């Protein structure tokens, strides 16, 4: 059966370049078009441009002619697009699929793609306790505030992972070129802060692990 | 060129009844000679790849359930799920294969009818190591509420103000299908020290008056 596999994650700096690979194997490579789409958070998907391993190979969309190019070898079954001069707004998700008559119809699995000067930080978490001065009604809500990290996610967890009732997580934010998130869970009054409740936050690219209890 | 306003924006329907999606195009797509309109309806699960659901604007790719009736032709165009599952849950896109550029949708996303819950909200102040290394930066959260739709409004001691005001919210849950939303107030240990009632308001259609929790420092 058909299948397109693509390039892992690129984690670059802006100015600079990024080419990345679209493997087709299951069919005739040679003999189909395949096009590039960018999917970026808050502006849907768009066509970049499509490619023909054979004879006349390339078409680019308007706004995409000067950066990513395309290329293919039709030897070893690859697709190729070159970006260049990388821009912040270039961070997006792009797919490579084998275009048709009336449509893709077979897709890759994506290759996500986030551009930032920001150095490679390790965070800095703070327990958020309610306060002394308080109305505590039954369930009481902890937070876990972790601000200042670069790249990728920060797994998060309550008491090691053994606590994952009414826990939130929310989505990582850009803050002075730099994420920042937050925790929440809720856990009866009858046990904090009766019992230690702790939130442990570990940064996978700096490769470091901060457990700090919250306390009142 | 081509436009595809795609409507509406998120539609929420309880499952067994049937929904619909529109797309219209700025001009037409349907081709003078072998008359076939060049629109695509595709779909894509919660963070993965979108998969293509009808073609040429009528007929289903194979592999999808009847279901997934197209039509329309010209410039309006329709998609209609006749009994929605939960395998349904995604966002939808029409996209044209007429001219060039190819263009898509802003696409539909498609959610889960529910009741009203009121925001669960509940401010915190900063922490001592935040001040000894850094700043202050006051954290309110907003949990479980339905639907999606609020607003938050930070208030210190009678000023306001949007600086520094950083805000996050969930996508919907996958159990209880309710939303969340976090809220900060990045400030400096300087000008935090001048200031005493720090509150955090919100407005939801279950309550007339807002969810309303302050902290004197």
């Given at each position: 059966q058909v299948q397109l596999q693509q390039s892992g994650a690129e984690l670059v700096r802006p100015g600079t370049s990024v080419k990345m690979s679209c493997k087709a194997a299951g069919y005739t490579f040679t003999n189909y078009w395949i096009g590039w789409i960018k999917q970026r958070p808050g502006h849907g998907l768009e066509w970049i441009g499509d490619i023909y391993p054979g004879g006349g190979y390339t078409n680019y969309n308007e706004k995409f002619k000067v950066k990513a190019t395309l290329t293919a070898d039709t030897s070893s079954v690859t697709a190729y697009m070159q970006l260049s001069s990388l821009t912040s707004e270039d961070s997006a998700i792009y797919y490579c699929t084998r275009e048709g008559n009336y449509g893709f119809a077979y897709w890759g699995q994506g290759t996500l793609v986030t551009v930032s000067a920001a150095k490679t930080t390790p965070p800095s978490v703070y327990p958020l306790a309610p306060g002394s001065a308080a109305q505590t009604n039954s369930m009481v809500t902890l937070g876990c505030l972790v601000k200042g990290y670069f790249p990728e996610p920060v797994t998060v967890t309550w008491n090691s992972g053994s606590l994952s009732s009414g826990v939130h997580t929310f989505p990582a934010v850009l803050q002075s070129d730099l994420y920042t998130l937050s925790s929440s869970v809720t856990v009866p009054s009858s046990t904090w802060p009766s019992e230690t409740v702790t939130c442990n936050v570990a940064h996978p690219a700096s490769s470091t692990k901060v457990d700090k209890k919250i306390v009142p | 060129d081509i436009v595809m306003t795609?409507?509406?924006?998120?539609?929420?329907?309880?499952?067994?009844?049937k929904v619909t999606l529109s797309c219209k195009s700025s001009q037409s797509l349907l081709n003078s000679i072998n008359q076939?309109?060049?629109?695509?309806?595709?779909?894509?699960?919660?963070?993965?790849?979108?998969?293509?659901?009808?073609?040429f604007a009528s007929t289903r790719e194979s592999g999808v359930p009847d279901r997934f009736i197209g039509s329309g032709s010209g410039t309006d165009f329709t998609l209609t799920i006749s009994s929605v599952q939960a395998e349904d849950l995604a966002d939808y896109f029409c996209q044209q294969h007429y001219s060039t550029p190819l263009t898509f949708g802003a696409g539909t996303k498609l959610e889960l009818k529910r009741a009203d819950a009121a925001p669960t909200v509940s401010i915190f102040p900063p922490s001592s190591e935040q001040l000894t290394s850094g700043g202050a930066s006051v954290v309110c959260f907003l949990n479980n509420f339905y639907p999606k739709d609020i607003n938050v409004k930070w208030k210190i001691d009678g000023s306001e103000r949007q600086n520094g005001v950083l805000n996050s919210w969930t996508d919907q849950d996958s159990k209880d299908s309710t939303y969340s939303?976090?809220?900060?107030?990045?400030?400096?240990?300087?000008?935090?020290?001048?200031?005493?009632?720090?509150?955090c308001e919100a407005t939801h259609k279950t309550s007339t008056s807002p969810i309303v929790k302050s902290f004197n420092r």
């Open positions: - | 795609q409507s509406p924006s998120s539609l929420a329907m309880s499952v067994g009844q076939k309109n060049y629109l695509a309806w595709y779909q894509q699960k919660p963070g993965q790849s979108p998969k293509m659901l009808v073609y939303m976090s809220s900060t107030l990045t400030l400096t240990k300087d000008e935090y020290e001048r200031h005493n009632s720090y509150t």
